[PDB]
């Protein structure tokens, strides 16, 4: 499609300030302010009443938004949002202001949660799709991210390779940013991920983050859930969403990692919903 090519960067042959870090590796707590138009697929899940940031999400077409199922449904915490409870805000930079003439707000038509989403035990298959009431118009600030194909997942989803997470979540586990934050994090070896937690991890998840010894740090935090973990393909220079911010024990704790929904493993379900609805 035209996915993954940003109007203000790729289209104009301009690079953002940290994309080099990702490409050099190919072979939000402790993040920084995003540049304008740096993540044009970033979406804010916003509750109508009370008005509050619920979660992040991503734009994958003119009508479809991808997020974590737990952002909508999590029985242990009596959470169960329906279409009429939520609004999606697209094209934003500022966390709190209504960005007149820039952002677009949409109502939801339908919410689809993975039928085998495991909220009882380990958040396995933490994924959901949301169909917009009306198609959103693309712009310099609004543009869809690509979904990975088998070949892209295979070559990019490797330990040590860095991906990028963005969101308007808290800056510390223990305030909130004024603008969208960004942080680049390395994918971690599955054994290391398993050995960091008592939670049973599945092939539908992967973890990322720096190991205690690596010196650098960073993580998603409250308000970042549902947001995109993206990587930039060195082959075609497009941005692909490899993961969804799913769960993590605290934020940026030494010895703990962030866990992400594995988008490609659940791609078949994604195609079914869209092809069917």
């Amino acid at each position: 499609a035209d996915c993954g090519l940003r109007p203000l960067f790729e289209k104009k042959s301009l690079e953002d300030k940290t994309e080099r870090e990702l490409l050099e590796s190919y072979i939000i707590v402790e993040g920084s302010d995003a540049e304008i138009g740096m993540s044009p697929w970033q979406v804010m899940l916003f509750r109508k009443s009370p008005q509050e940031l619920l979660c992040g999400a991503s734009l994958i077409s003119d009508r479809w938004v991808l997020t974590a199922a737990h952002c909508l449904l999590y029985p242990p915490w009596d959470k169960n949002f329906t279409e009429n409870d939520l609004l999606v805000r697209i094209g934003k930079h500022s966390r709190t202001r209504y960005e007149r003439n820039i952002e677009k707000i949409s109502m939801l038509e339908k919410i689809y949660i993975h039928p085998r989403y495991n909220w009882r035990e380990n958040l396995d298959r933490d994924i959901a799709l949301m169909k917009l009431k009306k198609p959103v118009a693309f712009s310099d600030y609004i543009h869809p991210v690509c979904l990975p194909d088998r070949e892209t997942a295979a070559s990019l989803l490797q330990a040590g390779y860095k991906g990028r997470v963005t969101g308007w979540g808290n800056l510390k586990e223990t305030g909130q940013p004024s603008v969208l934050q960004v942080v680049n994090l390395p994918i971690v070896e599955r054994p290391v991920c398993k050995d960091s937690t008592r939670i049973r991890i599945t092939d539908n998840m992967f973890c990322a983050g720096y190991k205690p010894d690596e010196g650098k740090r960073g993580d998603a935090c409250e308000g970042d859930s549902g947001g995109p973990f993206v990587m930039k393909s060195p082959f075609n220079n497009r941005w692909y969403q490899m993961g969804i911010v799913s769960w993590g024990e605290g934020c940026d704790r030494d010895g703990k990692y962030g866990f992400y929904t594995h988008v490609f493993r659940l791609k078949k379900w994604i195609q079914k919903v869209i092809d069917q609805f």
Binding site: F46, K48, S49, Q51, E52, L53, L87, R89, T96, R97, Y98, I105, M107
Partner: peptide
């Protein structure tokens, strides 16, 4: 949060 346009709430 800044109030959003009434045509949504």
């Amino acid at each position: 949060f800044e109030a959003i346009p009434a045509e949504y709430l």
